[PDB]
Structure 1
Amino acid sequence: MTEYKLVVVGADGVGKSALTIQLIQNHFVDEYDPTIEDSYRKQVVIDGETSLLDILDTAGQEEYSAMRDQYMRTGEGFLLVFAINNTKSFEDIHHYREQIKRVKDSEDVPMVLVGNKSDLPSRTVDTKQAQDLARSYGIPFIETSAKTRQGVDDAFYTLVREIRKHKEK
């Protein structure tokens, strides 16, 4: 079986944990403990290959130690998550991408930009704004709802496929 280390990053409250649990357990958990950082495993067949996804759902205090740097460096691909009704969480994406680039020592790291909470009508981040950011980064952009499950599988599997591409270069 091939193992993939995925890391889900982004501001508090954007739905990182909801997305992760939807993928793992196939249901929407509304108010999952905002402080728990943990990793979750799922076995799935993707494009004919049996794969073990090890998903780190990030949380907790903002700190920049060598210990945390090495922890994050073990990730092979990153989901950058913002909420489409929270402009600050979108503006924070630059920060998260630069910290990834810093610890991986590379500008070519598999990443996918996710705009979550698409089920809401109160949108503040334009789809064109978000797409344009992803195009300048050269990475895929997918809008999701952990509540309705729209796009969840697609976001995670697109990241797996990006990692496969990057290993085949």
Structure 2
Amino acid sequence: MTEYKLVVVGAGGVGKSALTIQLIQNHFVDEYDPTIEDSYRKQVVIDGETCLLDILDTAGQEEYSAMRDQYMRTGEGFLCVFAINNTKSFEDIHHYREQIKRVKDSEDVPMVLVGNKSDLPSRTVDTKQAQDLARSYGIPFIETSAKTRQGVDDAFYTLVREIRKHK
């Protein structure tokens, strides 16, 4: 079975841990220490093939650490996550893409833009705004809720399929 190295990046609070745990463990977690960086593992079937997902869930104080840097260099695709109710997190997306672009030294990096917390009504970022950003980056945009599981499989599996095609 093929193995895929996925990295989840984005501002503190957007739901990187909730998304990852929802994928891996099938639970919504609403109190997960924001300072914990961890790797997660799950065997999944994608398009009929058993896959092994290894997923790095990132914490803010690790951003410029050497060990992060090793994960980023070996990571094969990246979820860039913001929260649709937090404009600052959407403003931040360029920063995280720019860091990926630098470490990968590539314009050809599998990536998905993720608008999380789509179950919350107090929206501040339009889908059109995110789809325009995603278009400018050459990447897909996927709406997710780690709470309801909307789009969670789609976001991670879409990233895998990009990696698969890339390889």
TM-score (norm 1): 0.95
Secondary structure, counterpart of 2:61 in structure 1: coil
Percent identity among equivalent residues?
98
Give the C-alpha shift of residue 30 in structure 1.
1.1
How far apart are the structure 1 equivalents of 2:130 and 2:136?
10
Q: Deviations over 1:78-111 (max 9, x none)?
A: 0000000111100110000010000000011000
User: Are 1:77 and 1:163, in contact at CA under 8 Å, matched by a contact in 2?
Assistant: yes
Runs of 4+ that moved beyond 6 A? none
Segments of 5+ residues of structure 1 without an aligned counterpart are none
Q: Deviations over 1:104-157 (max 9, x none)?
A: 000110000000000111000111111000011111100110011111010000
How far apart are the structure 1 equivalents of 2:63 and 2:143?
29
Give the C-alpha shift of residue 66 in structure 1.
4.4
Give the C-alpha shift of residue 68 in structure 1.
3.2
How far apart are the structure 2 equivalents of 1:87 and 1:63?
21
Give the C-alpha shift of residue 62 in structure 1.
5.3
Paired position in structure 1 for 2:42: 42
Greater mean deviation of Cα atoms: 54-63 or 44-53: 54-63
Paired position in structure 2 for 1:23: 23
User: Are 2:11 and 2:60, in contact at CA under 8 Å, matched by a contact in 1?
Assistant: no
Give the C-alpha shift of residue 53 in structure 1.
0.1
Greater mean deviation of Cα atoms: 128-137 or 63-72: 63-72
Q: Structure 1 residues 32 and 66, CA, compared in 2 at 3 Å: closer, same or farther?
A: closer
TM-score (norm 2): 0.96
How far apart are the structure 1 equivalents of 2:156 and 2:68?
23
Secondary structure, counterpart of 2:102 in structure 1: helix
Give the C-alpha shift of residue 69 in structure 1.
2.1
Q: Structure 1 residues 164 and 121, CA, compared in 2 at 3 Å: closer, same or farther?
A: same
Give the C-alpha shift of residue 49 in structure 1.
1.2
How far apart are the structure 2 equivalents of 1:33 and 1:51?
28
Q: Structure 1 residues 63 and 148, CA, compared in 2 at 3 Å: closer, same or farther?
A: closer
How far apart are the structure 2 equivalents of 1:21 and 1:58?
12
RMSD: 1.2
In the alignment of these two chains, the number of paired residues is: 167
Q: Structure 1 residues 161 and 25, CA, compared in 2 at 3 Å: closer, same or farther?
A: same
How far apart are the structure 2 equivalents of 1:41 and 1:93?
25
How far apart are the structure 1 equivalents of 2:93 and 2:27?
26
Secondary structure, counterpart of 1:61 in structure 2: helix
Greater mean deviation of Cα atoms: 51-60 or 61-70: 61-70
User: Are 2:110 and 2:163, in contact at CA under 8 Å, matched by a contact in 1?
Assistant: yes
